[PDB]
């Protein structure tokens, strides 16, 4: 009889993310998962990645004047998952069509020529299994690369090639 | 009451564009211009640029399922402007907030590591001067970088650096 | 491309429709769906709705001289969808600009001061998922009120506020 | 906040269903579909079929002491499906052997000297496909008429003959 079931996530306060002001919700169970990259520098330790998660949030809130960081979750090369808007709140990662109906996860860095480590890949796959275990994602949920839905190079050639092999990938 | 022959623009039919299916209209005069880059391969001849304009449209319409190539106009390293959605049709290039109140022009190429040639810059500035002349754009229009309104590397470092200097650029 | 069936619809013969004389075809798949109201009497029983379908068709065919009832599908308060011109044939519901590129569905009755019952709205929405299932409609299809593309009160003040909330609604 | 389910299934609340106390769960995908008739009164309008679902469920709950109406779904001659125990709750329609494996759907009325209108039949065919689309009904499913699985006159004479002409029906 195991109820909680799923995953390990670095909470917002742990990375000192500003309080969010997004109130728009998704509808669980969510059908779609969109994978992106940050396109920025990558990080490999908890200390650097929480820094970065704060940098990312800063750009979206400071500059773009957003209600909170665009992604629902972020993926560090430290192999931890940073919580973004989370499972329940509509993100700003894929535009008007995909945002209202998906969870956006972004790997922190640039995978045009570089692969994320095995630990970052396990961190994201285990996070999805957790989303299913919680009923936040549909059991038969579909993974899209960002470039599948927006014109962009994101999530980078190397990461796009990996996510394509995934059990739930459907272009 | 003066209309001049400001357009030196390659018409859709001439670059062999697929017919647009877009119907939403911009209202003139448009206050904002948003400068992006295709983050793609550059083209330096009217022939290859005609083909590059085709490919960009082929991405947006065929893969992404969109009514047309996202941008209102496209700029070539050949020094010519390629007609996209044109002046009167809402483009799909910088999100729901900006798409309805702007014109989007994208330079065909990736400018993180190159500057576009002087001619493409001339094409772009001339294009914009034409829009004011025609009343498509406000006389005091504002230019934004794609990264100023949406999280992306576009228009690319070198090119972004250039537009920041422009007379009509606005923080 | 897919054998499986999708949705329930009262066929032409069942509601005693006059034979059609329309031949112009829509090009699959269709981008747009336009939602209208008859502004005519309403009905709540399979018997009374088949009669009303007949009356509207009759008005269109005999008074207006059209090749068939103008709408692709009609929706009755009995919660059934009534086949009109169907998915393949160009309707006459939204004018020359919109007719060739849309599916028009019309709720039978006047919705300025009334809402269609939840069963009507389900039926309408179910019909559209089937259009997509069938490849009749684009997966990224967009829904518009009749008033958004033509000057009319149709689809009625109250129903128009309702369709505004549909996942696929784009003014 | 999301689009409705396939089938245009009238929801339990819409027909003023007493709350369910049933807890046992069917394991999908589900192989058998069993078709019955209620041998109760019949109805041909949404107003009359709501009331008739209420009456059947009332008989099962109040008199027989069951957790919910026995059938997973009810089909009215108004052409709508009525949610009963649904796709996920084990029913009580065909006894102990059948209830755990099958999904039970019942036509509301006596079909010994009568046959359900084509709409009542479309509704039921519609329902089962939607159930496949949902993963509740396994794609290669078999239909049985109540007798095949239990000794009774249901699903009525004429209704039993049509059931046999379905592709999915098994001897």
From Swiss-Prot, chains A, B, C, D:
Gene3D superfamilies: Peptidoglycan recognition protein-like (3.40.80.10). Residues 28-156 form the N-acetylmuramoyl-L-alanine amidase domain. SUPFAM superfamilies: N-acetylmuramoyl-L-alanine amidase-like. GO terms for cellular component: extracellular region. Innate immunity protein that plays several important functions in antimicrobial and antitumor defense systems. Acts as a pattern receptor that binds to murein peptidoglycans (PGN) of Gram-positive bacteria and thus provides bactericidal activity. Forms an equimolar complex with heat shock protein HSPA1A and induces programmed cell death through apoptosis and necroptosis in tumor cell lines by activating the TNFR1 receptor on the target cell membrane. In addition, acts in complex with the Ca(2+)-binding protein S100A4 as a chemoattractant able to induce lymphocyte movement. PANTHER family: PEPTIDOGLYCAN RECOGNITION PROTEIN, PEPTIDOGLYCAN RECOGNITION PROTEIN 1. This is Peptidoglycan recognition protein 1. It comes from Camelus dromedarius (Dromedary). The lineage of its organism: Eukaryota, Metazoa, Chordata, Craniata, Vertebrata.
């Amino acid at each position: 009889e195991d109820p909680p079931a799923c995953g390990s996530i670095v909470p917002r306060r742990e990375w000192r993310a500003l309080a969010s002001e997004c109130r728009e919700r998704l509808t669980r169970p969510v059908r779609y998962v969109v994978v992106s990259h940050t396109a920025g520098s990558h990080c490999d330790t908890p200390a650097s990645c929480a820094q970065q998660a704060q940098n990312v949030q800063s750009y979206h809130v400071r500059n773009l004047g957003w209600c909170d960081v665009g992604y629902n979750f972020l993926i560090g090369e430290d192999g931890l998952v940073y919580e973004g808007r989370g499972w329940n709140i509509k993100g700003a990662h894929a535009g008007p069509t995909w945002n209202p109906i998906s969870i956006g996860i972004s790997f922190m860095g640039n995978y045009m020529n570089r692969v994320p480590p095995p630990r970052a890949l396990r961190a994201a796959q285990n996070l999805l299994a957790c989303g299913v275990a919680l009923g936040a994602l549909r059991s038969n949920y579909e993974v899209k690369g960002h470039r599948d839905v927006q014109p962009t190079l994101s999530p980078g050639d190397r990461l796009y090639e990996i996510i394509q092999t995934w059990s739930h990938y459907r272009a």
